[PDB]
């Protein structure tokens, strides 16, 4: 009772990276001694949970011919009188006696934390046993060690050495064609009807993962048997069962890192007929023409500071710029602040900076600038070392990041002078784009933009409402139009 | 006119419960435990 | 397999320092009887990871023919407290009867970390057992213990005393000729192609350690396997064993291997030097021979400069108009004396977490002693005044966390350690008087306005990173600004080069990109700020005290 080999879709690029890595040198002792290169004896898999970490390791090891020594994370170290080292020493000794063998250490993050979060004395005893025994496989015993984890930053940094764990394999989220491929291999044994369309389900589900796609098919079948129950004849899953499963359920974004691509098209902010040409040169031209920076030698400005009047400015002036990319948007916001008093102040940002170049393309939005570096970066600063650990990682991660992959940051605030001036250092914020107040030629098209899904009578004049708005921004244009919809439903009442 | 606030954190314990060296058990076997009232234990002789 | 002298490379000057230090107590103990002083017993190697320090310990042991024994780091901590002390005692007893012998221990940071940050029970257990055994042994068995770590001040400071561990040895990154020797040892079995050049790959990887070069060629050889993947598949269990001889790792596979790999040990700045000359900036010749009279005269004649009782000229400063080439001169001050140099800046290195804000200046003091010479340089002295603090009234001072470790040890080092602090501010009216004292900044180097009539020579050495038009227009590009130095001259270049992404799906550089660029000819550095300090350049001798 095990899974096959071709039961994984969407991860085809990382499959071809790992089929030549752990499957080809295992079955072939030649073509490495002849080339004079020893094969790697360690790989590391990481990414978001529910993406296929524990599934791909059992699939790649079954239909190849191997020993497949399984070992779980939390099941070790739960022993008494210090015998977890003997269970680890007998694990690697019994594998090489009947080579070829595969040692898959599952959940390695529950075994090796960092040395500043050490607990007791038996946690140090099992991380130094693993580091010693990993170096003992240099005799070319055809033993490949696969390690799966969830957080690569919480692991101990002494595991990635020359020989222990050299290669790392990152598993990203599938695309629209990737999420469609998993839906084909999940509705194989299910009785389906004819009204379903798997292309529309993959296009609607953007921020879904490899585990959320299994919830979409299993909940629609459970919904259908709640209807068909009276005094097993025909149980074809309909389109309305999948449409109900999209409503009552939700994707993996349970106030975690947000996976969505909510963007609006053009002419949704009023006017912009002289401002739209200023925003097309920062998120489209590094993607459409990357060779113009490599031929010259300039660094592309991946950051644009935004500031403007009240009303608009936060999201609809920034999310309407990236209409052509539509990648995953991982944002920081209000509640994403210093909630834990130890460690989780910039470590929640360390997986945003380092993953922006690993999981490219990924757009990171930055807002609420007066709640992160207001008093700490000033002339008075912080005295005592209590929470002065916020203005350091925002500056030292700027020079350490180059324009190798598709990175993009956007800073927006209501007060541009309330942020530290080192955030506006040269080399990173050389392009300053200012969003101005909408004038009389733009405020009339604002009222035509936020009245989109309305049964609006075109016989009236929306210019006469906007002509009485001089110091009234788009929020007051939203204020004057909300009262017009309050008495409109009252006419039906 | 200001404040300084800082929290703390702790780690409780781990244990092994290792005991019973072999030299204590070899002395633990060669002893007596007591015999009720009239449960003599005897002597014996022979092989002249 | 045993290793020798040819199996390592790059540190051949560094290996010769370790060579004479360990081969004299082993081979010839007659020098100890002649001079009557105890030779050292414990050396300590350190540096970036992946530099083959464990390979060098096996190379010096087999060639000398001594009794070699290895004690690895994490294998001691994998046991409990009882059997680990018994295994440490057994290693020193067998090496005593087998004199001469080398007891090489590895990874002392796992055994001896910094103890005062985590005051614990096991942090003083195995190191106190080692310290009574290392200092306690005395049998004249002339055995040498070698330590290895990745940071010299990460270990407990009680180990670096006299008699236990005295000689510190740094293992630096190899040079261009050094990194060439590393790949030649690994490619002894790799069947490479004829088009692969030996010296071309040395200049490609600038800051790669020997572990990074060895992983670079294996990934390029693995790309040769996936290039021939469609030729013979993996379903045949080595049936067609006749096409494998045509497997040559040609040189563009190394170009692909450089495109996917990344530098691992380059998380810090350069450890050797920077190379940008004074001719790379245009003009400023009135201070070129002036600085030759103050920093390169004492290091070439150490006797005539100090026998007259004159203090060493340790500190100079750069002041004048703000942002006018002194920020451009931040890197071009090290190539004159061609010494070691690491730049320090407020938001760069001293604005980290507590405890590490003074350890960065500790590394430049180990560079004053263990890696001499050194050059210290701090830029933008008006931004650091917010962290130092300003003295007010007649009773004041700079109550700063970092200035106590700075000012005490910068004057205790003599002229033989070759300490050289360099200053560069933007306004002399924004300098804290508590740091300034007679004896630190007595050398006045005034930086004037950077030659706005001759600023065409500044931008001539600035546009050499891009193929440009041969018919350039350099008539009045920088002579009408008079406040735009070489740092802000990039914005004029960014005006004439940001249009490459536009008008696309052809001309790239035209003469209209520089002719029409004079519409934003502004002046950020006005003449009202320059003339305040032009008279100060001839009257600072009467104001060289507090202010
Ligand atoms: N290509 C795929 N990618 C992600 N998930 C998949 C894929 N195909 C099937 N799944 C579903 O996801 C589950 C496998 O997820 P897995 O056990 O790897 O969780 P994980 O978070 O990736 O790793 P871990 O088990 O360590 O949490 C299966 O139960 C399966 O129904
Ligand atoms: N083109 C437009 N011009 C002005 N207002 C608009 C436009 N389109 C929509 N609006 C309305 O104005 C509001 C935009 O306000 P926004 O969310 O930017 O607040 P803000 O205070 O500007 O943001 P921040 O908190 O970053 O300052 C939306 O709620 C929307 O209904
Ligand atoms: N002469 C040399 N100089 C530098 N590197 C070398 C040399 N010869 C070989 N190398 C490469 O450098 C690596 C040596 O690194 P080593 O095994 O010493 O790691 P280390 O971190 O120094 O050891 P430790 O864990 O004891 O600190 C080898 O993998 C080898 O390919």
E strands, chain B, in order:
none
Through-space distance between the first and last CA atoms of chain C, rounded to whole angstroms:
68
3.40.50.300, 3.10.20.90, 3.30.930.10, 3.30.565.10: CATH of B1-48: 3.10.20.90
Instruction: Answer positive or negative: Cα dihedral of C377, C383, C386, C387.
Output: negative
Phi, psi angles (nearest 5°) of residue C216: -75, -40
E strands, C218-359, in order:
315-319, 341-344
Which chain B residue has its CA at the smallest distance from A341's CA? B7
Strand, coil or helix: what is A105? strand
Residues A39/A137, Cβ–Cβ less than 8 Å = no
| DSSP 8-state assignment for residue A300 | P
> How many residues does this entry show for chain A?
493
Q: Is A314 in the pocket of ligand 2 (CB under 6 A)?
A: yes
Q: Is A73 in the pocket of ligand 1 (CB under 6 A)?
A: no
Instruction: Report the distance separating Cα C244 and Cα C262, nearest Å.
Output: 30
- Ligand with the closest atom to the CA of A188: 1
Instruction: Report the distance separating Cα C528 and Cα C60, nearest Å.
Output: 67
Instruction: Answer positive or negative: Cα dihedral of C212, C214, C217, C223.
Output: negative
- How far away, in angstroms, is C49 Cα from ligand 3 center? 8
Strand, coil or helix: what is C434? coil
Contact of B1 with chain A, judged by CB distance below 8 Å, is answered with: no
- Structure tokens that stand for A334 in this block: 């209000």
Strand, coil or helix: what is C47? coil
CA distances from A267 to A204, A454, C127, C486, C538 (A): 23, 16, 71, 42, 63
Burial of B10 (0-12, 13-18, 19+ CB in 10 A): exposed
User: Among the residues of C146-209, which ranges form H helices?
Assistant: 176-186, 200-204
Instruction: Report the distance separating Cα C45 and Cα C169, nearest Å.
Output: 5
Instruction: Report the distance separating Cα A287 and Cα A363, nearest Å.
Output: 13
- How far away, in angstroms, is A317 Cα from ligand 2 center? 8
Q: How far A297 CA lies from chain C's nearest CA (Å)?
A: 7
- Structure tokens that stand for C320 in this block: 């004048």
- Structure tokens that stand for C68 in this block: 């070699």
Contact of A240 with chain B, judged by CB distance below 8 Å, is answered with: no
A306 bridge partner residues: A412
Residues C317/C442, Cβ–Cβ less than 8 Å = no
Query: Chains touching chain A at 3 or more Cβ pairs under 8 angstroms?
Result: B, C
Instruction: Report the distance separating Cα A482 and Cα A312, nearest Å.
Output: 16
- Ligand with the closest atom to the CA of C179: 3
- Using left for φ > 0, alpha for ψ between -120 and 50, and beta otherwise, residue C227 falls in alpha
- Structure tokens that stand for A415 in this block: 């007060």
Using a CB-CB cut-off of 8 Å, the residues of chain B touching A118 are 11
Burial of B7 (0-12, 13-18, 19+ CB in 10 A): exposed
Q: Which atom of ligand 2 is nearest to the CA of A314?
A: 26
Using a CB-CB cut-off of 8 Å, the residues of chain B touching A120 are 11, 13-14
- Using left for φ > 0, alpha for ψ between -120 and 50, and beta otherwise, residue C52 falls in left
Instruction: Report the distance separating Cα C292 and Cα C420, nearest Å.
Output: 14
Which chain C residue has its CA at the smallest distance from A389's CA? C353
Calculate the dihedral angle through the C-alpha atoms of C373, C378, C379, C384, rounding to the nearest 10 degrees: 170
C-alpha closest to that of C313 among C299, C297, C300, C294: C294
Instruction: Answer positive or negative: Cα dihedral of C501, C504, C510, C516.
Output: negative
Domain ranges of chain B: 1-48
- Using left for φ > 0, alpha for ψ between -120 and 50, and beta otherwise, residue A258 falls in beta
Give the CA count within 13 Å in the CB-facing half-sphere of A254: 6
Resolution of the structure in the document, Å: 3.9
Burial C199-224 (b: 16+ CB within 10 A, else e): eebbeebebbbbbbbbbbbbbbbbbb
Using a CB-CB cut-off of 8 Å, the residues of chain B touching A119 are 11, 14
Instruction: Answer positive or negative: Cα dihedral of A446, A305, A392, C392.
Output: negative
- Strands lying side by side in the sheet with C167-170: C67-71, C101-105, C144-148, C42-46, C167-170
- How far away, in angstroms, is A371 Cα from ligand 2 center? 20
List A residues 178-207 in contact with B (Cβ-Cβ < 8 A).
Answer: none
CA distances from C255 to A401, B28, C484 (A): 21, 73, 40
Angle at C171 between CA C110 and CA C203, to 5 degrees: 125
Pocket test for ligand 1, best of A57, A108, A211, A213 (most atoms within 8 A of CB): A211
Using a CB-CB cut-off of 8 Å, the residues of chain A touching C76 are 128
| DSSP 8-state assignment for residue C395 | S
Is C253 a known ligand-binding residue?
A: no
Q: Which atom of ligand 2 is nearest to the CA of A443?
A: 3
Residues C345/C379, Cβ–Cβ less than 8 Å = yes
Instruction: Report the distance separating Cα A156 and Cα A112, nearest Å.
Output: 6
Residues A323/A487, Cβ–Cβ less than 8 Å = no
- How far away, in angstroms, is A387 Cα from ligand 1 center? 39
Residues A261/A328, Cβ–Cβ less than 8 Å = yes
Which chain A residue has its CA at the smallest distance from C150's CA? A158
Using a CB-CB cut-off of 8 Å, the residues of chain A touching B7 are 341-342
Instruction: Report the distance separating Cα C136 and Cα C536, nearest Å.
Output: 64
DSSP structure string for B2-24? --------------------HHH
C-alpha closest to that of C483 among C450, C520, C516: C450
- How far away, in angstroms, is A260 Cα from ligand 1 center? 20
Is A238 a known ligand-binding residue?
A: no
- Structure tokens that stand for A25 in this block: 């040198």
Q: Is C298 in the pocket of ligand 3 (CB under 6 A)?
A: no
C167 bridge partner residues: C43
> How many residues does this entry show for chain C?
547
Q: Is A54 in the pocket of ligand 1 (CB under 6 A)?
A: yes
Is A150 a known ligand-binding residue?
A: yes
């Amino acid at each position: 009772n095990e899974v096959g080999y071709d039961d994984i879709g969407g991860c085809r690029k990382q499959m071809a990276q790992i089929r030549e890595m752990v499957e080809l040198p295992l079955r072939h002792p030649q073509l490495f001694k002849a080339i004079g290169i020893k094969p790697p004896r360690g790989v590391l898999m990481y990414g978001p949970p529910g993406t296929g970490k524990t599934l791909m390791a059992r699939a790649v090891a079954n239909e190849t011919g191997a020993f497949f020594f399984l070992i779980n994370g939390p099941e070790v170290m739960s022993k008494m009188a210090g015998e977890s080292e003997s269970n680890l020493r007998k694990a690697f000794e019994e594998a090489e006696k009947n080579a070829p063998a595969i040692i898959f250490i599952d959940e390695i993050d529950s075994i090796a934390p960092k040395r500043d979060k050490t607990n007791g004395e038996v946690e140090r005893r099992v991380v130094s046993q693993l580091l010693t025994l990993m170096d003992g496989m240099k005799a070319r015993s055809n033993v490949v060690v696969i390690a799966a984890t969830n957080r690569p930053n919480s692991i101990d940094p002494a595991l990635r050495r020359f020989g222990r764990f050299d290669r790392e394999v990152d598993i990203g989220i599938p695309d629209a064609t990737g999420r469609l491929e998993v839906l084909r291999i999940h509705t194989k044994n299910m009785k389906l009807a004819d009204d379903v369309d798997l292309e529309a389900l993959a296009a609607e589900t953007h921020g879904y993962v490899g585990a959320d796609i299994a919830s979409l098919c299993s909940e629609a079948a459970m919904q259908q048997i709640r209807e068909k129950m009276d005094l097993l004849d025909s149980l074809g899953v309909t389109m309305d069962n999948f449409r109900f499963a999209l409503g009552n359920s939700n994707p993996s974004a349970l106030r975690e890192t947000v996976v969505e691509s909510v963007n609006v098209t053009w002419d949704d902010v009023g006017g912009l007929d002289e401002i739209k040409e200023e925003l097309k040169e920062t998120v489209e031209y590094p993607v459409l023409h990357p060779d113009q920076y490599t031929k010259f030698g300039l660094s592309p400005s991946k950051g644009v500071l935004f500031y403007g009047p009240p009303g608009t400015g936060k999201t609809l002036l920034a999310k309407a710029v990236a209409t052509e990319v539509s990648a995953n948007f991982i944002s920081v916001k209000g509640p994403e602040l210093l909630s834990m008093w130890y460690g989780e102040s910039e470590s929640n940002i360390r997986d945003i900076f380092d993953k922006a170049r690993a999981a490219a393309p990924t757009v990171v939005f930055l807002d609420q600038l007066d709640s992160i570096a207001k008093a700490r970066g000033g002339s008075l600063g912080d005295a005592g070392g209590a929470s002065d650990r916020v203005v350091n990682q925002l500056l030292t991660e700027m020079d350490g990041m180059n324009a190798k992959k598709n990175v993009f940051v956007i800073g927006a605030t209501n007060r541009p002078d309330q942020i530290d001036p080192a955030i506006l250092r040269p080399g990173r914020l050389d392009q300053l784009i200012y969003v101005p107040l909408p004038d009389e030629n733009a405020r009339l098209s604002i009222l035509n933009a936020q009245l989109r899904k309305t049964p609006l009578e075109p016989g009236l004049e929306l210019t006469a409402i906007a002509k009485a708005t001089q110091g009234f921004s788009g929020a007051d244009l939203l204020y004057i139009v909300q009262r017009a919809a309050k008495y409109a439903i009252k006419d039906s009442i | 006119q200001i404040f300084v606030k800082t929290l703390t954190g702790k780690t409780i314990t781990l244990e092994v419960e290792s005991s019973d060296t072999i030299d204590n058990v070899k002395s633990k076997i060669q002893d007596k435990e007591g015999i009720p009232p009239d449960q003599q234990r005897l002597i014996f002789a022979g092989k002249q």
